[PDB]
Amino acid sequence: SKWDQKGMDIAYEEAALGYKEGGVPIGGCLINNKDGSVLGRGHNMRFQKGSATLHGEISTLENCGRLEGKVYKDTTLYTTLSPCDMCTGAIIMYGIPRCVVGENVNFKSKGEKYLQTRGHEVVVVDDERCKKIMKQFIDERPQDWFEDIGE
Amino acid sequence: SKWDQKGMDIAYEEAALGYKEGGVPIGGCLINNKDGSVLGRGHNMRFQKGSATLHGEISTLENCGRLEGKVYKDTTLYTTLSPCDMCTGAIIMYGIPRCVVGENVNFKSKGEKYLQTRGHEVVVVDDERCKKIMKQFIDERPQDWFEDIGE
Ligand SMILES: O=C1CCNC(=O)N1
Numbered sequence: 001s002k003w004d005q006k007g008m009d010i011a012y013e014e015a016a017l018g019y020k021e022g023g024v025p026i027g028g029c030l031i032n033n034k035d036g037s038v039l040g041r042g043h044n045m046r047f048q049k050g051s052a053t054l055h056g057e058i059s060t061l062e063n064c065g066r067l068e069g070k071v072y073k074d075t076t077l078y079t080t081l082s083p084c085d086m087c088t089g090a091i092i093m094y095g096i097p098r099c100v101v102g103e104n105v106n107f108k109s110k111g112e113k114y115l116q117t118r119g120h121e122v123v124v125v126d127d128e129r130c131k132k133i134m135k136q137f138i139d140e141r142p143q144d145w146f147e148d149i150g151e
Numbered sequence: 152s153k154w155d156q157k158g159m160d161i162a163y164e165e166a167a168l169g170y171k172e173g174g175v176p177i178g179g180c181l182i183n184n185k186d187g188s189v190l191g192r193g194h195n196m197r198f199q200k201g202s203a204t205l206h207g208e209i210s211t212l213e214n215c216g217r218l219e220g221k222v223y224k225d226t227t228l229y230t231t232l233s234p235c236d237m238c239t240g241a242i243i244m245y246g247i248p249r250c251v252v253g254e255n256v257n258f259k260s261k262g263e264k265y266l267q268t269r270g271h272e273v274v275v276v277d278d279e280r281c282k283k284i285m286k287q288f289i290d291e292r293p294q295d296w297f298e299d300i301g302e
């Protein structure tokens with residue numbers, strides 16, 4: 001938990017950057033729990049790259065590059081928004097032990113609790129900066145948001 | 152199952168192509184159940200693109216491009232190998248109702264059963280061509296395989 005302010009700050013920075021670029025304002029970063037080093041950071045690239053899979057968490061993992069499985073085992077994935085079922089699956093597959101979530105007010109899937117069933121620790125920070133930026137996007141571009149969650 | 156021969160054949164062609172390129176031999180395709188049209192096809196791009204997220208199923212969905220959510224609701228995703236937790240999550244997130252699996256002998260995750268608990272139909276075809284090519288990859292390159300599944 002000692003790196004949680006740092007990780008959510010970086011994830012929010014990515015969400016804000018993505019917002020400026022015209023995309024969905026969701027950002028993340030993967031941090032090594034031991035030394036606080038940032039293995040990678042990213043944001044949703046649906047609009048930036050016409051991508052159906054680069055959600056913020058997925059873009060973050062893609063940006064960390066190829067890694068041996070053991071590296072993920074003592075990391076925390078920070079995401080400004082509670083993970084959808086796909087991102088939840090990614091956290092589970094790599095065995096990232098902790099997921100720190102900015103907010104789960106604008107969105108939540110069954111994945112937040114499935115992570116816990118599968119043994120991961122989930123922390124919801126209830127970060128207002130994250131809530132404000134996602135709420136704005138949802139209010140202004142609802143159709144774009146529904147597409148991002150496959151609705 | 153009208154389009155199942157068609158879809159698994161395309162998925163296998165993709166798996167064979169990835170094998171030739173030096174990557175993990177897992178392929179897939181997404182088909183519209185109404186007319187049999189192919190929305191997209193792909194294969195694992197871990198080696199080809201140094202990607203931690205492009206498993207065959209994810210690369211297939213990326214290749215279909217941005218789509219309105221309703222499109223996925225009457226499709227079938229063909230994958231030559233039973234889906235990991237991440238690819239399982241993608242299927243659930245987009246609401247793809249049906250997943251046809253080449254084989255689940257060389258690998259099977261908790262996702263095959265999770266898909267069913269979440270209401271999706273899973274059909275395992277037990278295709279010998281898929282089993283053969285994946286058994287070969289695991290035998291020759293065990294370390295690369297463990298990396299592709301976060302172990
Ligand atoms: O997983 C979350 C949900 C939706 N979009 C995004 O990028 N991340």
Ligand SMILES: O=C1CCNC(=O)N1
Nearest residue numbers: 195206207234235238
């Ligand atoms: O989901 C499966 C598991 C492993 N790798 C891959 O590309 N597909």
Ligand SMILES: [Zn+2]
Nearest residue numbers: 055084086087
């Ligand atoms: Zn997601």
Ligand SMILES: [Zn+2]
Nearest residue numbers: 206235237238
């Ligand atoms: Zn997978």
